[PDB]
């Protein structure tokens, strides 16, 4: 049974700084600087900040080309996600829900509630029809900082994740520092995700952040133990551009040629002779003789 649980508040923003870097593939590298192009959250981007405090932010958000998701809490309020299009009985949707012992991932035609939630029981959907995918494994989930990257490429729903303990700061913002996200699971689902929603469990305070990935070039530094410890966004500013070109996180004093300046066209100009008579192909092809 769906239960309708509010007002709408304007979003807050936080400073992403240097976060959202994940291992681009499953290949060991060490003591090397590697250049790769992939979907990454842009450095120093603007990230939307939602609150769960009597207010519980759980709006339907766009997925765009990939989502960076992060949350900070102690009470484990955020326990799952819904991904899909219309998010109703007309299409297949992906439901990812964690609990005390396991994680259940299934793709089915769910008729989702107007305001879905868990109540420790599922009050996420009223009904479901014929499923196409099922997967069960171990749970995905000072305060606990949990970060995820959700990508949907060629039918594969790729999840990267990292979990670290963080010290509590009064501003209650995103911490500085570099931490790379390791691959968690790769699900061969084959559905079109355009929207997603966060599932909260009721019975405390929590907050989460949402950013969007872009096609950018990064230089990744692998240390002795193949761990990524730093990265450069080659499309952030002129200094990073030079660093990427010279394959070094360090630039020596001097002048370097790194790019090219080119003015783009602004209008389409089409000029033809003014002719109103049409070519008599009909009188050639449809001839009697």
């Amino acid at each position: 049974q769906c239960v309708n649980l509010r007002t709408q508040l304007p979003p807050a923003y936080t400073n992403s700084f240097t976060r959202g870097v994940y291992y681009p593939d499953k290949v060991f590298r060490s003591s090397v600087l590697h250049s790769t192009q992939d979907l990454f959250l842009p450095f120093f981007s603007n990230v939307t900040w939602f609150h769960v405090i009597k207010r519980f932010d759980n709006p339907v958000l766009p997925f765009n080309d990939g989502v960076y998701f992060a949350s900070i809490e102690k009470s484990n309020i955020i326990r799952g996600w819904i991904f899909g299009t219309t998010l109703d009985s007309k299409t297949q949707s992906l439901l990812i829900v964690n609990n005390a012992t396991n994680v259940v991932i299934k793709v089915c035609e769910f008729q989702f509630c107007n305001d879905p939630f868990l109540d420790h029981e599922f009050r996420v959907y009223s009904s479901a029809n014929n499923c196409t995918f099922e997967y069960v494994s171990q749970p995905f989930l000072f305060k606990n900082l949990r970060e995820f990257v959700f990508k949907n490429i060629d039918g594969y729903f790729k999840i990267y994740s990292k979990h670290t303990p963080i010290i509590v700061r009064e501003p209650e913002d995103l911490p500085q520092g570099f931490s790379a996200l390791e691959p968690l699971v790769d699900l061969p689902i084959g559905i079109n995700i355009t929207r997603f929603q966060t599932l909260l469990a009721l019975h405390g305070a929590a907050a989460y952040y949402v950013g969007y990935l872009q096609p950018r070039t990064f230089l990744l530094k692998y240390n002795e133990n193949g761990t990524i410890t730093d990265a450069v966004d080659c499309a952030l500013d002129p200094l990073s551009e030079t660093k990427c070109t010279l394959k070094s996180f360090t630039v020596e004093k001097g002048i370097y040629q790194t790019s090219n300046f080119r003015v783009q066209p602004t209008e389409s100009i089409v000029r033809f002779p003014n002719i109103t008579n049409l070519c008599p192909f009909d009188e050639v092809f449809n001839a009697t003789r």
Partner: antibody
Amino acid sequence: EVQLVESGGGVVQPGGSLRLSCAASGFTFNSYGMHWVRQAPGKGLEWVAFIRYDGGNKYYASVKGRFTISRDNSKNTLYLQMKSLRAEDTAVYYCANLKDSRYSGSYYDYWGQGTLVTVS
Amino acid sequence: VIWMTQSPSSLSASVGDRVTITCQASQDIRFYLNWYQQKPGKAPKLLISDASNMETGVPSRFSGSGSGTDFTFTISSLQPEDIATYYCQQYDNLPFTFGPGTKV
């Protein structure tokens, strides 16, 4: 509250040009795609252009080759640059965020008030 | 380009009457149709999304259904506040298009 404010309207001559802008506030402008829609006196709603959230892909209607759509996510501002304006382009121009489960993914539908552009 | 049409272009009805508006697409657009209501001097308001889903805040007297090329918009009981021009819009593919508009 969510607002979309059009400006830059007015009267121009045929063959001339006009740049319109729409200031957005109250929502995460930089995560949504945006549309331009126009309506001339006596007629229905005509779709003009669409731009994706990252300012990357652009789509155009009757206006392709003359109108350019762009945005600046650091100012929350949507732009429409209209060149080679014709008498037929007289209309009230709206900026909008149209509910769309297939392309933009928007779950909410927002409209501005519209700005009048006259070509004569 | 998918062409949209509506019928009737204009209809006469009193308060308490049942009103139906037909929207037809030249191509199969499954269930990706929006219905808008526009009052004079105002921007269009969305009433129905994805063919049959009602928007929050929309009175229960409004409804709609259909799939493919033939869609229906219904007012179970016309109110004095329901006098407006109604449009259907497809978002199956770009460019997006609006119908001619039906005058109630």
